[PDB]
Amino acid sequence: YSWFRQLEIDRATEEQNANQMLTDILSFMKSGKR
């Protein structure tokens, strides 16, 4: 019988790029740089 998802770990990478994206947008509000 069967007995006991990395994608959920990858969700953290999603949060990571979301965070860098936050750094990007704050840099934008600071400067308008894209």
Add this chain to the structure above:
Amino acid sequence: SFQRQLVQRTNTLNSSIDNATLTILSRFQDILDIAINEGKDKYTVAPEVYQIECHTVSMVRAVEQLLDVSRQIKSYWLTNSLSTSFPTVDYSEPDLEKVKRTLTKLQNHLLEVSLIEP
């Protein structure tokens, strides 16, 4: 962080589950080891009986542990936020006009109003 909280909580849940199931199956599995009769000394048989009963009680207990988990999960599914404020009796939507005529009349009670004019 928000994530690791639910994650570790899930780890706790899975832990309790696997521990309970493994407990039941282990206690039952060892009864067969206890099941042997012939060739044993008369004294040696005696503890084994109590061992049987204790394994059984351990099984039923882990069964209780399972429901104990189930109540937790049920509680988690009712701790979530409502999608919306609930509907009620919006029926018979109140008039504005009568309220005005009543307030204005009572405020003007025994009073000789003489129009407005600019």
Add this chain to the structure above:
Amino acid sequence: MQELYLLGVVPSRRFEAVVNSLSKTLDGPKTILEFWVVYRPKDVPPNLPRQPDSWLRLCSNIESHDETDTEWSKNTQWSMYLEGNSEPKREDKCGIRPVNRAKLTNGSVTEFVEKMGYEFSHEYIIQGLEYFFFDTTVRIYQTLIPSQQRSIKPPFHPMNEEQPWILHVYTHVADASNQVAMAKAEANLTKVKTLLSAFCDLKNVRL
């Protein structure tokens, strides 16, 4: 006025739940729409601070004002901000920066930045919601790009297909010298932090 900012990324994938949550545990929502403008100093040699925050930021509520109008650029209410840098090596506890809410009222509005010699620089539209909590307040960000320069006609341009909602807790200390008021403020924000940490991950960020 020493503002006590906080920041919190919200993925758009889960954004609505945050709204339904905050509405059931905070004052408001009050609707938020606004049109930032930056007018750039241009002088040489140093010492010009010429800092990225040193660039001035005029502000203007635009939501109540109708979209169709084009003369809103001066007729609309206006204000002016500085927002200095946050104090160095400020972690755990919220970062803190000076802020000055100037206001003005005349038919001559934008022109004055040129009167200071300042000229047009980067600009962006904010949209979201604010939530009261006695003194403290939390506003959520969306930095939409205007469809045209100084235009108020939707659609406005997202920075990306999946723009994060930029949550921003803050409060406004009347003056830095009062460590008492600082205590009451840090306390209030602490309570807010506890209040909404359950479904979000706020953190101090340098500025």
Add this chain to the structure above:
Amino acid sequence: SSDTQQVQNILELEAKIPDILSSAGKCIEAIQLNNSLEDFRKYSKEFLETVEFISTGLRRQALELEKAEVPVVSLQPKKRYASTPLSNLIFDQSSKLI
């Protein structure tokens, strides 16, 4: 699958658990009262699925509890001050008094 529905799904899981007792006691009974190894092979073959399906069902429902991303801690309610239905309700009574 939404909100209460998963709970109802849990209700489906609820019936299975107690029986796991007697079934085990059935299995032993095959070597006991029935004195038959084969029937024991049968009911022991049946018995384990009650364990596996429920265990996996729990792990998966809990996984759903994580996918739903319901927060680990119950939120402290604000002192809600004026939901609309309360308002037009009180207004309804106001007209009712008028």
